[PDB]
DNA sequence: ATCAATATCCACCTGCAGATACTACCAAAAGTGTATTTGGAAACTGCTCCATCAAAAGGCATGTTCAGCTGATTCAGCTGAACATGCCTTTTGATGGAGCAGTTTCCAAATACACTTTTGGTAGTATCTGCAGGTGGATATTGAT
DNA sequence: ATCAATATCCACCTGCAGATACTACCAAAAGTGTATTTGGAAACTGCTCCATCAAAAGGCATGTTCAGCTGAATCAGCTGAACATGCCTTTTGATGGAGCAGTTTCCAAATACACTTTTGGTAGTATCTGCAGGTGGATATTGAT
């Protein structure tokens, strides 16, 4: 009965923006969920350590940013950082 | 009477199983091995079906990986025939051993 | 009521991510932007992989992505492969590859 | 006709794995060598899995137990939860 | 002049118990400090995860204990688990 | 007023281990048994290493343990070697070991 | 500031004899002549990796000084944990 | 005029360096390499001396370990001479490449 | 080369295992209004870190010499690849019930807060002691003969 | 074997850096003692989903045959080890200057927290279809001759 949360729907929305006439199997979706959780934990984990190394009590977008730079390969890292910066900007400039 | 030369079917099998993704160990004998092994850590244990599958996916992935590294070791020694010394050398360099 | 995801231009649940950060014992406190940033990053990465796995599906004359398509996409990209270098994708198999010295001579 | 469980991992199955891993020709000593490796792998993962199970006061090994075991053995698996 | 703390002193006590006539260089003590911090994090960390996996919000001696069985190899785990258990038991009946 | 160490029968600081478990953000709450158990495992492990290093010191005719003696201890003990198998001990060197084929004659 | 010498080709400071000594410690009896450039290249990649991460910690903390701790944290991330310099 | 045969000194060096723990790379040259490389990532950086020593301990430990694995790879090929292909195979199986 | 055996590819067909779609709650995001908490922005220290200069040795660069290792070549013998099939082991699908998971309860044990006490860190001076690096000089080890 | 060159060993011996020793200040812990909150163990039990097993399914054990791979043996070429020789660069240890880590004290902004609305996201249920297999026939590949 109790709710079992997953990303399997945001994943689907993005699937559509990217490949509108393309679907996805249940297993493939399991793999996407594992992915998202994994990367979540890795990035959140580095953020955590960063904050702790610098005696701060707060994980801010800077920690997430530095953490991305440390965890992702070059090109991915670059693009990711700009995406993540664009989204904050768009959220800040939004009364 | 028709007969393929040694290595021709081998290559054929390489192409076939590199295309596909099905598990390559029969489920039941695997499942028994899991249970046999788990018995020494705790008695009267039951296994979700997906748990045993997770295990099998992981072993076969691991073993197929090891065979790649093993093959490179055989080739390194200018052979084409994987041997125990090749599996041992690969495991050693991976840091699973010695 | 506007969702933070919608404010930030995102399909990925900014609120949920905030909650997951709070209740993962990662830090005492969590800035406002962080979960938006993080959400974005996870969306971006998701899209890259779906894009490339989509193409993989297309190449094989198919409309539905399966694990095999994710595997081919990931292992055929220098960067994703590295990011996912210690990860096993169930039901992905491997890339067709045969050492040249094993091919038949004549 | 009684038989060992490890021997249920048969010569042809081991041969199929080797083929998926790109192997052309195989020494006859491999099959026992492989069985021993497989056994160590499974011992290590199951030992940790079951330790998860026990911690959770259960008598059923769940996939998540296995997934977490794989994770901390540096063999992260995707598609069975987590 | 800010207090930089370390295990250098407990380490020395324990040194004197096992080897009463033996000293230790400050570089050797540097290493023993690294060791303690390392194994602290690795146990605390497994525990963190282990509680989180079981939707518990508290790390008890029981989480540490599993943490230890998961982290240490065979015989070391066995002995570490005795001494833990022994300390906790003794501690419990000392108030 | 008795220290918790002494209560528990330990040289290693329970008070301090409790505190580090808090500020390290490992969980919301920490049970009173945790620091006690953890402190004791830590002490056990350091006693194990120091016992083995002390012996290396003595074997090399030395009174004071240095990093080489810690390395010889760890690398020569199968279970310490595995526990610390991805760790580098500064100024420890390596175990003397020469592959047999490399030696002279037959 | 006034000047600051241009650093170039310092990888060649990792000399053939220093590399041989390292090989010896590794138990190597005989060394082909091409080892030395290969070793220099592998070393360069290792350093770049550790230093990028170390400098990344440095920059994150808004310092201009790379600390032993920055290096220790970078080494840990890379799965080359080091004992003897803090942390 | 006296001569040790090829290999004899090599084994002597192996015994010697396996016995000691000093760094085998000269300090100053390694310090420059660090500074040169760091500089390419970022100008106007300074280094605690202990950072450069930490780096040098890490590098030497890595390289010696890589040579052990390399040596195993040569001896697998029935040679006693390490060659680049041995380093390359070691690093592949290590998952560095 | 030619020629047959057999694998492989491609078009087309189709039932249904497994997607996609829809509904309708409702836990959990978002909105609102205080109640803390924090990370700087300025404003100073005392450091470590950089630079540089001189002296000195200790190790590096180089060229010569040839020992013995590597890789090419040949080859014989062993050892794994290929092969047909019914015996038997696994796969498949049907059915009790073990136990995971839902839910509620309540107190043993957790945090919180304000005192009180104690210890572990450093800094100032002082002493000490292990052993690094130097010295012969007695005991191997290696390689020519 | 025997002999000579030279590396190795070991043990004793003085200078001294690094270690141990107080001494003493003290600030930050750690402890102690109520007041307050609650996480999770305990106990009951609903209902998945797991072990078992009967019939249906199709992969593997087997023994023979010989293609071709591995390892042994031989050897010519040349690479890499050893060593002598000439001196550059690293090491060591000063000295000065300052660029900058590291604190401390005030707040303005930012984040948590308790309390209400107001959905977006899930499980349960209902349609919809991609494609896994099947066949049929053409063509490519391999291996014999
Ligand atoms: Mg430059």
Residue numbers in the entry:
A (entry chain H), E (entry chain D): 28 to 122
B (entry chain A): 38 to 135
C (entry chain G), F (entry chain C): 14 to 119
D (entry chain B): 21 to 102
G (entry chain F): 16 to 102
H (entry chain E): 38 to 134
Quote what the paper states about this structure.
Histone proteins package eukaryotic DNA into chromatin, yielding a structural hierarchy, in which nucleosomes comprise the basic repeating units. Each nucleosome consists of a core region, composed of ~146 bp wrapped around a histone octamer, which comprises two copies each of four different core histone proteins. The H3–H4 histone tetramer organizes largely the central DNA of the nucleosome core, while the two H2A–H2B histone dimers organize the outer DNA regions.
We generated two distinct classes of binuclears with either rigid 1,2-diphenylethylenediamide linkers, yielding three stereochemically distinct species (RR, SS, RS), or flexible methylene or polyethylene glycol amide linkers. To assess the nucleosome site selectivity of the binuclear agents, we carried out X-ray structural characterization of nucleosome core particle (NCP) crystals incubated with each of the compounds. For all of the chlorido agents, substantial adduct formation is observed first at the RU1 site, entailing bifunctional coordination of the ruthenium cation by the E61 and E64 side chains of H2A. On the other hand, for the three compounds with rigid linkers—RR, SS and RS—there is electron density between the two RAPTA groups, consistent with the linker moiety. For the RR and SS isomers, the two RAPTA groups are positioned side by side on one face of the diphenyl linker, whereas for the RS isomer, the RAPTA groups are situated instead on opposing faces of the diphenyl linker. This differential configuration allows the RR and SS agents to form bridging adducts at the RU1 and RU2 sites, thereby cross-linking the H2A and H2B histones. However, subsequent to coordination of the first ruthenium ion of the RS agent at RU1, the second ruthenium ion is correspondingly locked out of position to allow coordination at the adjacent RU2 site. Instead, the open, extended conformation of RS fosters coordination of the second ruthenium ion at a more distant histone site, the E91 side chain of H2A. In addition to the primary RU1 and H2A E91 sites, there is some slight degree of adduct generation by RS apparent at the RU2 site, but this must coincide with reaction of a second RS molecule, given the stereochemical constraints of the linker. As such, this implies that coordination of a second binuclear molecule at RU2 is sterically disfavoured subsequent to occupation of the RU1 site by the first molecule.
